[PDB]
Design a protein around this ligand. Structure first.
Ligand SMILES: O=C(CO)N[C@H]1[C@H]([C@H](O)[C@H](O)CO)O[C@](O)(C(=O)O)C[C@@H]1O
Length: 482
């Protein structure tokens, strides 16, 4: 009766419905609970067949036929049917359903079932990464989702190698093995419990006491001490801290003001004291180790005087605003340093307010009831291609229109044209993406302050084949006990 126990670092901030499950711990749970037709490996990010019975057969440039894995089953016993696959795509694509993820499949024109086994995928244009993106659209049980979406959001039913048992905020997420799963990554333990330990001291203690076998997001100050008994490995990651403005609210609609507040921040002090060197001031949308990294034409290295000159040019004589920030432990350590830099400026006064992530977005950001936010973000949980990473924040309406309120600008429209150019025209995508990034880096509606490295601690003697993620989350796919 072997079990796994893990210490997770992000509180539950969304439900588990893949239509909208953007919170880290939710996404990390759904890698185990759901399957795309093809999935990405949480460590290697390589694609593998999941619900797809074999490699998608491409009839022509716009048309793909995909077949279902014989005997596929949802956790409630029903079979995975081709109607479920179609419902899964149509509901993400349906604007009335309010998904957070349709801007990850803009190339998809139709998803039609041809019979009990086969689904035709019709594309609006040739798109090379069609297999790669299927991991974003998890296949969901229509007949359960239609009896009540919010009940499914709280008790997710999937076809993955683990079934959901229960989830209790501040406590734990619980899974059990799915014994009819017939994919590539069957569950190697019976019971899996994820303790929700967002407090750094508590997370460390759990691991250092031996009460859990691995923990996410090792606190930087505790990293070396924990190597005494445990493997600790720090991975370079797209994971970042962004600065987000409400671009409908004066004076933050003036890019001139948004730039000054980046210049005012002393990133080096931040990297030394909070991250003990394990992060890097942003020099572009990507981190400098990302394969498509191309240095941006705007850089924002600590320059107070430029920040002053820019505010004077904007006509800011006495700005007061509240900074909203999430509750994560390392975001709490960054907030004073940030505020100290802004409050150093002659014309700016800044107060601070922390909120749980879930409440920050649903009660403040989603409603425009803010001015300035810092929060962590890691869209590479969805994959690593540049268009994916840009699209998260800059395609469509999910962030630019519903959240940072910049879709009204000409720069926004020009970023749309550039993003669409680059996925239609692979030959010219590099050039198009550099123009889009330079526009983003000059306008800074939402833009990274730093990218950081992720430490994961685990016990090599107790687990088998565990590897740390280059993103948020833990993965126990193919991971055994001992
Ligand atoms: O970047 C992504 C991609 O799903 N999601 C981020 C997620 C996302 O920004 C929120 O759910 C709002 O969409 O926020 C957090 O869960 C958090 O602030 O606690 C971090 C998480 O990485």
């Amino acid at each position: 009766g072997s079990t796994i126990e893990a210490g997770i670092a992000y509180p539950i901030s969304t439900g588990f419905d893949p239509l909208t499950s953007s919170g880290a711990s939710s996404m990390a749970a759904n890698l185990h609970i759901f399957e795309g037709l093809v999935d990405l490996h949480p460590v290697t990010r390589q694609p593998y067949l999941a619900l797809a019975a074999k490699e998608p057969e491409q009839k022509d440039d716009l048309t793909y036929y995909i077949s279902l894995r014989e005997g596929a089953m949802f956790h409630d016993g029903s079979p995975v049917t081709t109607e479920d696959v179609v419902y899964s795509f149509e509901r993400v694509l349906d604007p009335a359903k309010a998904s957070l993820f349709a801007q990850f499949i803009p190339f998809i024109a139709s998803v039609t079932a041809l019979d009990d086994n086969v689904v035709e995928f019709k594309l609006k244009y040739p798109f090379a990464l069609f297999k790669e993106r299927l991991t974003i659209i998890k296949i969901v049980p229509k007949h359960i989702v239609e009896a009540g979406q919010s009940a499914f959001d709280a008790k997710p039913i999937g076809s993955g190698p683990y079934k959901f048992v229960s989830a209790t905020k501040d406590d734990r997420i619980v899974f059990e093995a799915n014994t009819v799963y017939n994919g590539h990554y069957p569950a190697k333990v019976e019971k899996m419990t994820w303790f929700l330990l967002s407090d750094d001291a508590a997370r460390v203690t759990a691991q250092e006491s031996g009460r859990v076998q691995a923990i996410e997001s090792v606190p930087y100050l505790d990293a070396e001490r924990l190597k005494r008994k445990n493997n600790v490995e720090s991975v370079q990651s797209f994971g970042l801290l962004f600065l987000m403005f409400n671009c409908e609210k004066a004076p933050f609609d003036n890019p001139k003001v948004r730039q000054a507040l980046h210049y005012a921040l002393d990133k080096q002090k931040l990297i030394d004291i909070v991250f003990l060197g394990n992060a890097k001031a942003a020099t572009s949308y990507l981190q400098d180790t990302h394969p498509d990294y191309v240095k941006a034409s705007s850089q924002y290295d600590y320059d107070k005087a430029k920040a002053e000159k820019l505010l004077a040019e904007a006509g800011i004589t006495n700005l007061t605003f509240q900074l909203l920030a999430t509750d994560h432990a390392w975001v709490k350590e960054c907030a004073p340093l940030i505020l100290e830099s802004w409050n150093a400026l002659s014309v700016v006064k800044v107060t601070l307010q922390h909120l749980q992530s879930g409440a920050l977005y649903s009660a403040h950001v989603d409603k425009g009831a803010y001015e300035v936010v810092i929060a962590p973000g890691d869209p590479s949980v969805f994959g690593n291609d540049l268009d994916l990473l840009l699209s998260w924040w800059y395609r469509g309406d999910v962030w630019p229109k519903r959240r940072f309120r910049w879709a009204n600008t000409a720069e926004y429209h020009e970023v749309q044209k550039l993003l669409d150019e680059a996925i239609k025209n692979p030959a010219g995508s590099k050039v198009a993406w550099q123009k889009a990034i330079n526009i983003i880096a000059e306008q800074v509606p939402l833009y990274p302050i730093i990218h950081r490295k992720l430490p994961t601690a685990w016990n090599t003697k107790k687990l088998t084949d565990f590897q740390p993620l280059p993103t948020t989350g833990l993965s126990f796919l193919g991971v055994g006990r001992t």
